[PDB]
Amino acid sequence: PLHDFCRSRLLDLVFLLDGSSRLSEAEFEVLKAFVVDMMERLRISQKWVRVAVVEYHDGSHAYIGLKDRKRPSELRRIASQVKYAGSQVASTSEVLKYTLFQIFSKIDRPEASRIALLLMASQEPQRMSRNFVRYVQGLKKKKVIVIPVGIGPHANLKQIRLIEKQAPENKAFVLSSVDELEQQRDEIVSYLCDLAPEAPP
Numbered sequence: 011p012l013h014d015f016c017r018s019r020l021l022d023l024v025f026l027l028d029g030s031s032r033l034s035e036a037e038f039e040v041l042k043a044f045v046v047d048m049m050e051r052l053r054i055s056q057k058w059v060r061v062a063v064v065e066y067h068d069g070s071h072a073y074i075g076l077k078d079r080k081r082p083s084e085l086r087r088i089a090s091q092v093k094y095a096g097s098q099v100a101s102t103s104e105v106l107k108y109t110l111f112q113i114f115s116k117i118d119r120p121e122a123s124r125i126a127l128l129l130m131a132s133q134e135p136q137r138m139s140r141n142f143v144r145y146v147q148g149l150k151k152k153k154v155i156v157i158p159v160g161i162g163p164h165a166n167l168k169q170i171r172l173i174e175k176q177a178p179e180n181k182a183f184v185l186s187s188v189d190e191l192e193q194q195r196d197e198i199v200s201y202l203c204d205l206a207p208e209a210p211p
C-alpha cells in the first residue's frame with residue numbers, strides 16, 4: 011500500500027523527460043512508468059504538491075502544467091500516455107529555457123519549494139548549448155532546484171556537472187539504465203521531499 015512521501019510538504023515538482031532516440035520506445039515507457047510511480051507517492055493538489063510534465067526533443071511539449079486543476083488520477087493517466095518522440099536530439103537547453111521563462115516566469119507560490127527533475131539520456135548538439143549556463147543560473151536565482159538524472163552512457167555528463175557544481179542541493183543521480191529507476195525511486199523521492207518545506211502547525 012502506497013504512502014505519501016511528501017506528507018505536509020509544499021512543493022512544485024517539474025518532470026523533464028528526454029525525448030530522444032537514445033531511449034528505445036520500451037525504455038521511454040520505463041521512464042514514464044517511473045514518473046507515474048513518483049506521482050503515486052505524492053499528494054497532488056494546489057495546496058500541497060503541484061506537478062508538471064514536459065517531454066523535450068528539439069522543442070518541448072508540456073503535457074501537464076502546475077496550475078492544471080485536474081484530478082491526480084487524470085494527471086497520472088496523462089503522464090503514462092505521453093507520446094514517444096524518438097527524436098535525433100533532446101535539447102536540455104531548450105527545455106530549461108521553457109522551464110525558466112514559462113513554467114516559472116511568475117513565482118505565484120513562494121511558500122513552496124520548486125524542483126526540476128531533469129531526466130537525461132542524451133547530449134544535444136553543441137550549437138544548442140550556447141545559453142545553457144544562463145538558463146541554469148536563471149533557475150537558481152528563482153530558487154528552482156535543478157536535479158539532473160543521468161540515464162545511460164549517452165547522458166550529457168558536462169551539463170550534469172555544470173548543474174551539480176552550483177549548490178549541494180543540485181545533487182545529480184547517475185543511472186546505467188532506465189531499468190534502475192525503480193530501484194532508486196524511493197531514494198530519489200525522499201531526497202526531493204527533504205528539500206521541501208513543511209506546513210506550519
Ligand SMILES: [Ca+2]
Pocket residue numbers: 032
Ligand atoms: Ca541503447
